[PDB]
Amino acid sequence: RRDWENPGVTQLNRLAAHPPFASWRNSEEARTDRPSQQLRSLNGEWRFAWFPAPEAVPESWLECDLPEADTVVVPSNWQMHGYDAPIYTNVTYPITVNPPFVPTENPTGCYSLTFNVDESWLQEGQTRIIFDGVNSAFHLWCNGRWVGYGQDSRLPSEFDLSAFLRAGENRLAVMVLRWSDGSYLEDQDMWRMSGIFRDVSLLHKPTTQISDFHVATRFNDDFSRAVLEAEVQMCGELRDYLRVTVSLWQGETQVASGTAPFGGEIIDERGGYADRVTLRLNVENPKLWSAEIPNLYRAVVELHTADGTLIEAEACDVGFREVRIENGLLLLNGKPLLIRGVNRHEHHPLHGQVMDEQTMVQDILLMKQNNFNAVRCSHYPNHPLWYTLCDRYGLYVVDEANIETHGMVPMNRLTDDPRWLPAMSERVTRMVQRDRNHPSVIIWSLGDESGHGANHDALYRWIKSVDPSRPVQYEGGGADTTATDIICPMYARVDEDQPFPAVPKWSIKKWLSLPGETRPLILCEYAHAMGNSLGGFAKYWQAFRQYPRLQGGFVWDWVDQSLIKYDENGNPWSAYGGDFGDTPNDRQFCMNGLVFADRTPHPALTEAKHQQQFFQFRLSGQTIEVTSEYLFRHSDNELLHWMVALDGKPLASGEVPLDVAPQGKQLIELPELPQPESAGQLWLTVRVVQPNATAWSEAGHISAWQQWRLAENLSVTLPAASHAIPHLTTSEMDFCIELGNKRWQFNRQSGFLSQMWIGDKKQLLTPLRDQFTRAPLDNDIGVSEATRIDPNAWVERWKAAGHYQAEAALLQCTADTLADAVLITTAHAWQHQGKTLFISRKTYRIDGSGQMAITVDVEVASDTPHPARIGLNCQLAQVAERVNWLGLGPQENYPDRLTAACFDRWDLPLSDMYTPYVFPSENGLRCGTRELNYGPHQWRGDFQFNISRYSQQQLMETSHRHLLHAEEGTWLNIDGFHMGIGGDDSWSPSVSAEFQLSAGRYHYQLVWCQK
Amino acid sequence: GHYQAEAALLQCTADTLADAVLITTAHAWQHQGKTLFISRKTYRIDGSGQMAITVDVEVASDTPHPARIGLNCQLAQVAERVNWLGLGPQENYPDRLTAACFDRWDLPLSDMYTPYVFPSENGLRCGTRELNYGPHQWRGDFQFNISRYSQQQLMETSHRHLLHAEEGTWLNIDGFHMGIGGDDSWSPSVSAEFQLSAGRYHYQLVWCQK
């Protein structure tokens, strides 16, 4: 029988699914959540051998260990040990679309273990084995004997070993098939691995046992009174003396208790459930669970005799909370949610898809440190500890079924097929059975990117019927099917419609009010953070805040799915698709995080943290109004710091504690403003600070900030008239200027400033030429490659117009002498195939002070694609330690990604001005800059800029950061104007009309001087 | 102080170029000790007889955003026709220019003034590259209006019938203009993308006798 090729067989002899057990035998250990003797982890050094196909596996592996087998760590993906390649594929299957068959070359992992078991486990009780995650299907042997079969890579498989166990040495044998009929429901946009990648364990239950328990909490109108209902189910021999007690703890205090005999109410004509009982505990004035305040109670479920003997106990965390959709709103505890969320894949750059507590906690802190409150299990149920961490630190969780059929044509070919409903239903139902007791799970998701079929309809209704306490969502088939309670599109832009046939992605604002529509909107994915991205993020959050039925979204996504590779000198580097010999591959598309794989943030993270603040600020005269957006908590851990500065120079500051109620306003009056002496701009800043450490943040955490322009004093005083005069020395080839030890050389053929001098030290390498192009970002490229060109792409537009290779064709180069200065006047035109793309007109001016005032005016042919940048570049000779700039930062910012940045004097090392995206591009831009010191140099004006050892050439030519090499001296780009980075999605132009450079005529002036 | 602000000369110089003459001026507008505007211009007069005017304005961030950034003068001439290659034929402004079309437009002088019963700024036309009036021609990228009434007369007059045509012709050429609003007419209604908030502004004009 080929079960890995049959969707009518998803398991054999697999025991039923259930909430997480521990079979505690001591109620205090249960209550306190301490370890239980009755649950052994079998994680450790296992034996493993790899095979090309299940048919190549010898029959001697079932009885004895293969000598050629290696001793490896479990849990793990055998790819991370390098037995075969990991495959990154986005949409297209890693196998031939041939339901139900998989390839006859099917990578097969033969795991096994020799173990020892307690005498009392052999004496009595049920001993089961629990593989938390096996990817993708497997057969199980114990002591040579066949036990059962399992599918679905992201939920636990459990089998009874009691009848298989022997005295002394026992032997497991787990045959892991990488591909199965199960692979057809597991087509997520991620790395394709396999193995026993989650916990393996042994649970020892009494024969008369708790087999299930359900914890429900309903409320009255003000949540001042709550009932806790606990349905308890058992297996084994019922006896008149058995009892169940459900107790509820808050700290070290019982709050209420329920004790009763098995025997449920009459259900139907035939009676009730004799093997069940339902306990009701009344709880007055309960502490409610929210992400804002993760108030947890503890529930202990004791199976015991009326005479007072405990048989076993199971337990969970309880958060009193109600989630309903009323009058078009997602309410939590009767308050409307604002989902500040992100999609999170289970990923590690060393371990693949194996998860650990240290990583999770790192992820959970960071997210909450960067103003996130919700997360989507994109796109499968997670390692079980995740929900517990979420319950305790406080995050709203979308628990998502392990069904994805992105590769089907059309996407619903399987989800509309009733032959596939059983395989689908297992994947949905078994998530609930497992996860229904976690307070942190607020929404059930029916899977991802699988179109819309009757199967989705069928399972939605199953969930509604089985768990009325939670809304069900699903993006498939239009994001507003009969199969979702929430309009939950992916990448639906804010203002712009995208009227795709059958599945249009409307503008979110317009979507809400489509005729007859009432449901709320929360994007299941938005703001593709791929490479230099998240441009246009502030536009979402403004709309989220204005429209009450817009209730947020989950960013795509948390972490970069890069995997560590090592080089010839044994040095690590981050690798993406096709870097493993895997093909077809979707290259750098596995990498869309706000953080790098090692959990270093991309600079897009600070934008998100800023936009997702919980306090809103207004300024009206000298009056700051602070608004809390919190639904539940007061600001019991906040003080507002305020700061006024005249162009980076502190003028005054202070502290006022925030005592803001949830959704209230504090009016903080600033003292009589100290009116400044000199000339510049006053900028107000406010940072909100948490003085006390929490479980999620250090003492001093800055949770919110905002700046404002106050009074500006325009500079009027004339230059202190110097008594030096710059001398023009005109030759045949170069207009040359002197002034003391300063020397300027303008070339007559090129028409550009070719070299500067300080004494005998030349200042340049590459001349100060114009630039109208950038090394393309992932958003610029999109889906386009050399073999299939996407003609629509921003980059392919610039390539096909000539933007990238067009050459300066000097129209004029003159040099008149001024009274107190020297004045050079250039003109250039850039051409390609007889078309004039850009005319550039400049006027350099050098006075007796050393200051060189460059004035630039550019013309842009209205019918060429709008250019990426309008500015200048030169390769400076000196290599420096510091960069110093008055303007936005300190971090990298772009026209549509600069809200998070702050105007001030910033001093960073040169390498912080370079952003090491795994796919190299335009990076380290800092906008709205007025002054820029590096070495002895200084550029004043109103511009944006980037300064690195990498040319735009090297960046656009190299595909991996690790293969870049510092160049001689330092490349400087100085931009009058830069186009948006975009990123509403990464497969179509997404730079908004107001951040495209479209004016036609552009002006900007620079001042260059040695300090 | 926008209506009573007095230009105070900071700089006025001239330079003898190889094939042109260059006027360089700088100004600062003040009121109660606070600089409202600054305007650094170059006036370039070369052998073609063409005068190249370039204006680089600075608006103080904390001052309310001005209604226009541009130039005005009273012309000695009074002519019969106005001819222009810009948006037209009728009155149009930055936030009310969609009905207008870009083409060659020739109208009598009186059709360049809109007889609004309460008199105000009027008759402007936007995105003009070329404008002719008698001997004169201006080029660049600007908005303009033209009439026998000064801006001064218009605001000081309560009804149109009380307007007297002044001597010569009044020209207001702007590089930038604030939109007009009208969502209501009892509170600021000019959208943000039509307010002049940039802080630094640039427009340039060529004046010559055709």
Ligand SMILES: [Mg+2]
């Ligand atoms: Mg099967």
Ligand SMILES: [Mg+2]
């Ligand atoms: Mg997909």
Ligand code: NA
């Ligand atoms: Na809202």
Ligand code: NA
């Ligand atoms: Na991806």
